[PDB]
Paper text:
We report here the immunogenicity in rhesus macaques and CH103 CD4-binding site bnAb UCA KI mice of sequential Env immunogens derived from the CH505 HIV-1-infected individual who made the CH103 bnAb lineage. In macaques, vaccine-induced nAbs  had epitopes overlapping that of CH103, bound only open trimers, and neutralized rare tier 2 viruses. The antibody clonal lineage most similar to CH103 we identified was an IGHV4-J, CH505 differential-binding clonal lineage (DH522) with autologous tier 1, and heterologous tier 1 and weak tier 2 neutralization activities derived from memory B cells of RM-5556 immunized with additive CH505 Envs. DH522 lineage mAbs did not neutralize tier 2 CH505 TF, neutralized 7% of a panel of 199 HIV-1 primary isolates, and blocked the binding of CH103 lineage Ab (CH106) to CH505 TF gp120.
For comparison, we found that the DH522 lineage antibodies bound natively glycosylated and glycan-deleted CH505 TF gp120 Envs equally well, but did not neutralize HIV-1 pseudoviruses bearing these Envs nor bound free N-glycans.
Author numbering:
A (entry chain L): 2 to 6, 8 to 27, 27A, 27B, 27C, 28 to 95, 95A, 96 to 106, ...
B (entry chain H): 2 to 35, 35A, 36 to 52, 52A, 53 to 82, 82A, 82B, 82C, ...
The structure:
Amino acid sequence: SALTQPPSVSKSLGQSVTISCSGTSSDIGAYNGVSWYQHHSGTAPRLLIYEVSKRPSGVSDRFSGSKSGNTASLTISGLQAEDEADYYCGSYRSGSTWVFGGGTRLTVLGQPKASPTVTLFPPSSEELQANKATLVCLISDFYPGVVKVAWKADGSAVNAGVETTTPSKQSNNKYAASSYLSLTSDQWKSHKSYSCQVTHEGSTVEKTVAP
Amino acid sequence: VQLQESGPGLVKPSETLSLTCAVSGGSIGDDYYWNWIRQPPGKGLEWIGSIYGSFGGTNYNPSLKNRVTISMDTSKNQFSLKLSSVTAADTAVYYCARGSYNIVVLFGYYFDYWGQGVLVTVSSASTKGPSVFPLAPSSRSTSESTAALGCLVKDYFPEPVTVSWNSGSLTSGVHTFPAVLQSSGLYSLSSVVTVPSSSLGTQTYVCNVNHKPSNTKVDKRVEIKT
């Protein structure tokens, strides 16, 4: 906070969006010094714009910036999937400090539907010696980023022992997620088959492992 | 020009966080601002403070100035951060960053070059190194003539673990999946790689699991089930 941005904006592929940044007369309105920053999950913030409208070499044409009074604006044209990120404005403030905006999370809508590939692994022999068994179900290449996972043991639903991650974007702009079934070696060996079932957009993939 | 954060990923509440930024590819006594910025989870970016290369003057985020000291050592070519009386709300990714300026009273300054970020977790709970187990190759979910294999990295704390394959010489078809967090308080993740079925038996495959918060490294050989 202290500089105000919309929490999120959503636009379709190809369209253009504007991200605003409301500050004060000691900041945005005091200097020609608002910068913008692109922040992809996992890497450091990348400078997009400095001194209100300047682009560093290497930042695309589609990114532009301006300001009017105490409000600065960032405009992205020709929105692509890759543009999905958190975007921050910031500025020098009188008294020699620095303040960021709260950040805007950009979603880009209209991307192609992709069903997940599902990779299920049995516990290792080594882990089974230690009397525990972890089934690893890796879910990849899906869009949109929402799946429901269910585990079965000889056709019977399992609820305990299960932890599933929130979908996260791969380099190729599709989504990945994993689900884990934590068992004891006793449990694992006493069933004939375990199954990992992933439902995406009304369709289900099922992989099975066996002792 | 490069910046690189180092320091403990784990710090007990009430105690003092210490980070150092080693600056390469340019001197640290030049005409620049050296900055610390953090990002608590879900929160946004937050400037912490800065030190000025040529003279060493510091400035701090007003709501953190009583808890923060930023220093610089011109030999070693580093600057550093100390944050006192830490709490759970200081759990964050910390970045160092260079502030480039022209005339501060007209244009301020901006952050052109950044470090990569180090996660710091505030927690009374102790360090826990991972147990690594093979994920045996399976062909059914990949393309023809290939198979996927990997490593389960189990029960560590805190984040992060990094995985590479065959000492970084195998980077094609690698996918490391985001960690999962158990009710135990520990994390686990998996890294997999898609390789040619023909190379199994011939080519040795090793996941290089790196867990810096516990100073533990594991190079695990991934075998077929015997």
